[PDB]
Design a protein around this nucleic acid. Structure first.
Ligand SMILES: [Mg+2]
Ligand SMILES: [Mg+2]
Ligand SMILES: [Mg+2]
Ligand SMILES: [Mg+2]
Ligand SMILES: [Mg+2]
Ligand SMILES: [Mg+2]
Ligand SMILES: [Mg+2]
Ligand SMILES: [Mg+2]
Ligand SMILES: [Mg+2]
Ligand SMILES: [Mg+2]
Ligand SMILES: [Mg+2]
Ligand SMILES: [Mg+2]
Ligand SMILES: [Mg+2]
Ligand SMILES: [Mg+2]
Lengths: 49, 35, 151, 87, 283, 50, 24
RNA sequence: AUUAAAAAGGUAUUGUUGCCCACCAAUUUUUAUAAUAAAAAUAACGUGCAGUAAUUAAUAUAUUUAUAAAAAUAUAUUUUUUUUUUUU
């Protein structure tokens, strides 16, 4: 999943941060899952990975 | 590495599910704050 | 004691406020009614007349005695002032509920029209053309959000 | 599942009704307009009930009886029944 | 409400696409926000910290001819005393970061030497090999310091350990020499430092400074090691780091290294950093 | 054209990636100079010189 | 009562006792 | 030559020019019809300004009071903000 959370850095400043949830897997017996809140889409992707 | 384990590139690293939903908390508290 | 109120006011308000003010006269207090907010001088004394003609109606039944004192018809304020009977010797010697009548009304009216026409300002505010969203509930025809018919 | 909105179906999936009135009603903000409401009648065990329903249908040449169907929710509060076809 | 209507601009021979989306925004609630920052090749290679991969011949050639980086950093800092350059806080930062690259590794070792009552005899090959392996696993990031420490104290020593300890120690605090000679020995035999002494010196120094501290050899469990919340870099435990009315409007007015120097649109009366307004007389 | 001169002779570097090391980035109340280098002004004068 | 929220108020805090009341 | 740095709440959610509270008209709908039935939808008009530690802090019970939110007193209490003598 991808999603959008607002991140308030100050009473004026507001950023749009997105939220990623994914899971890495290999059918060979090894998986893992991650999530992250980052500024960009690519960012939350790499982060969560 | 070069810095702390509980702080990543963008701010505090968000362990509980409260931080994924409310990620202001990751970077903000008070007036005195730096990265 | 002073109750200042607006020009646009409901029957409801006139009623309970009337009774309030009369009950204050009953207690020997100084009483003055004032409109400092008005669209027109005309409607302003419309309200002053209303409230007073409610106060008469109510206060003559509970038979509490007072005399009308001062009518100040002014640019920025339209006001009338009452005072109570001092004692029961003042209620028995002079027994009256005394109010203005058409002469003082219409005269202080003309005096307010001219006092206001001189300074060139006919009200502190005026009604606005804005129409807020309104539902009428059940209707026999189509109606837009402000409550007007569909041609 | 809200089982009390079906009160006048009396356990049946569809109902028959006779037309009486049609008035208009304004839905809950922030949705504005005029929603057409049909005021209907039907009888059960010699009792005559007045059923009040949303009019979504297509009216052709003048006709009397409709087919009332069940739920979902709509903008208009308190509207629970809907129209299927007109006879 | 008289909402401002901004016409979109299309890419141009001198106004390329990415330039447009970066320097121009059609939503005028986003005007006048602030300045944004980006990086190209070298500043990006620094920031992003992408560890290179070993590769074909050129990467291995570059591993071979690499030489000493710790000395190179220092040369490059020092070289700021050359007539044609300045003295750079960045060159010094890079120096610092190469001097302290290991750093926390040493820190870990301090704890194994000083933070543990009775860690057996540290000369015996057994406990020694425990220590060696865990150290090599704190370096190279295979383990957390917390995990390595909790490993070290829970490592297997000898049956009926406490009851043998009653035959040596009263209150169970051994002597710390074997521990330090061991922990220097490991860093020497592991290849941890480029220059041999540094291991021993740092480990020794960091202990001697902490010797003066109130309740020196105990530590709060949460702040002792890596955890979500941490201490500020001055207070970390064995760490290396242990007008006036007009000034906010002055800002730029000192002798100031700049990044992007100000421009005439963005600064009204400022003359440049070099300017000396009240000059003294010198021969 | 007369504007044929003002075309871009080479391709401009894209902005691919994050803020550079120790960039100004701004939290609640932060007085920010894009202009002043963050690292090298914070350096003490006795070392670097006036 | 008034059957609807007059205020749109979403607190984001999830205190562990409010959630697992079996164990606390 | 006299002083100043460090402890604090939001029913709002680019956030006090923020939101909400009752009475006061129409209507809509169910019924167990108490000055003037009750309850629920609801977007007028008019009075205020009850609440968000919010201009005499709030909350609950109790008794009283009443244009309308509510107010007075009696108890308990913090979903209110803290200020701290180990025989002087
Ligand atoms: Mg604070
Ligand atoms: Mg049923
Ligand atoms: Mg709906
Ligand atoms: Mg809600
Ligand atoms: Mg809150
Ligand atoms: Mg009814
Ligand atoms: Mg009712
Ligand atoms: Mg109060
Ligand atoms: Mg208030
Ligand atoms: Mg209060
Ligand atoms: Mg109370
Ligand atoms: Mg009570
Ligand atoms: Mg009251
Ligand atoms: Mg009460």
């Amino acid at each position: 999943a991808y999603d959008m959370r607002v991140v308030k850095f100050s009473p004026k400043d507001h950023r749009q941060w997105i939220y990623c949830v994914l899971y890495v897997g290999s059918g060979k017996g090894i998986a893992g899952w991650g999530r992250a809140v980052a500024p960009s889409t690519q960012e939350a992707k790499k982060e969560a990975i | 590495r070069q810095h702390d384990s509980g702080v990543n590139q963008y701010g505090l690293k968000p362990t509980n599910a409260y931080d994924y939903i409310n990620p202001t908390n990751l970077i903000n508290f008070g007036r005195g704050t730096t990265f | 004691i002073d109750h200042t109120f607006r020009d646009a006011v409901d029957a409801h308000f006139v009623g309970w406020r009337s009774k309030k003010i009369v009950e204050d006269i009953r207690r020997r207090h100084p009483v003055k009614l004032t409109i400092k907010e008005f669209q027109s001088p005309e409607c302003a004394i419309g309200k002053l007349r209303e409230m007073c003609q409610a106060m008469q109606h109510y206060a003559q039944e509970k038979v509490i005695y007072h005399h009308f004192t001062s009518i100040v018809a002014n640019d920025r304020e339209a006001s009338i002032t009452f005072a109570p009977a001092l004692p029961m010797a003042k209620s028995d010697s002079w027994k009256h509920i005394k109010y203005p009548g058409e002469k003082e009304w219409t005269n202080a009216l003309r005096r307010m029209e001219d006092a206001c026409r001189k300074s060139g300002r006919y009200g502190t505010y005026a009604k606005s053309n804005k129409l807020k969203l309104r539902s009428l509930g059940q209707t026999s025809y189509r109606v837009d959000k402000y409550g007007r018919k569909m041609d | 599942l809200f089982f009390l909105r079906m009160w006048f179906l009396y356990g049946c999936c569809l109902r028959f009704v006779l037309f009486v009135l049609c008035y208009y009603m304004s839905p809950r903000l922030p949705s504005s307009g005029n929603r057409r409401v049909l005021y209907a009648v039907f009888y059960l065990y010699n009792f005559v009930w007045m059923l009040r329903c949303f009019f979504c249908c297509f009216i052709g040449l003048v006709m009397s009886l409709f087919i009332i169907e069940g739920g979902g929710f709509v903008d208009l509060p308190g509207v629970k029944y809907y129209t299927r076809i007109v006879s | 409400a008289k909402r401002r209507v901004i016409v979109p601009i299309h890419p141009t021979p001198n106004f390329p696409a990415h330039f447009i989306k970066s320097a121009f925004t059609t939503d005028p609630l986003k005007e006048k926000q602030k300045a944004r920052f980006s990086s190209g090749g070298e500043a990006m290679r620094e920031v992003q910290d992408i560890p290179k991969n070993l590769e074909g011949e050129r990467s291995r050639r570059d591993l071979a001819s690499r030489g000493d980086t710790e000395f190179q950093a220092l040369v490059e800092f020092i070289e700021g005393a050359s007539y044609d350059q300045l003295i750079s806080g960045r060159r010094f930062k890079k120096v610092y970061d190469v001097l302290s690259e290991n750093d926390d590794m040493f820190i870990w070792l301090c704890h194994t030497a000083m933070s543990v009552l009775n860690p057996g005899d540290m000369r015996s090959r057994l406990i020694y090999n425990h220590l060696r392996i865990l150290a090599e696993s704190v370096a190279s990031g295979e383990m957390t310091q917390r995990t390595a420490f909790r490993f070290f104290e829970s490592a297997v020593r000898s049956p009926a350990y406490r009851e043998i300890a009653k035959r040596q120690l009263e209150g169970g605090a051994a002597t710390r020499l074997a521990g330090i000679s061991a922990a220097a020995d490991v860093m020497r035999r592991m290849g941890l430092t480029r220059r041999p002494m540094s291991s021993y010196f740092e480990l020794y120094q960091r202990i001697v400074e902490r010797s003066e501290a109130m309740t020196p050899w105990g530590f709060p469990p949460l702040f002792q090691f890596e955890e979500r919340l941490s201490l500020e870099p001055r207070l970390k435990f064995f760490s290396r780091a242990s007008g006036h009315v007009m000034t906010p409007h002055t800002t730029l007015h000192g002798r100031r290294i700049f990044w992007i120097p100000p421009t005439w649109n963005r600064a009204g009366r400022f003359l440049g950093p070099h300017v000396t307004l009240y000059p003294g007389m010198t021969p | 054209y007369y504007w044929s001169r003002y075309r871009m002779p080479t391709q401009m570097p894209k902005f691919d990636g994050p803020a550079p090391v120790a960039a100004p980035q701004s939290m609640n109340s932060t007085k920010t100079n894009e202009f002043i280098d963050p690292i090298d002004d914070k350096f003490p004068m006795s070392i670097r010189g006036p | 009562l008034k059957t609807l929220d007059v205020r749109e108020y979403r607190p984001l805090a999830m205190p562990i006792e409010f959630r697992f009341y079996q164990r606390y």
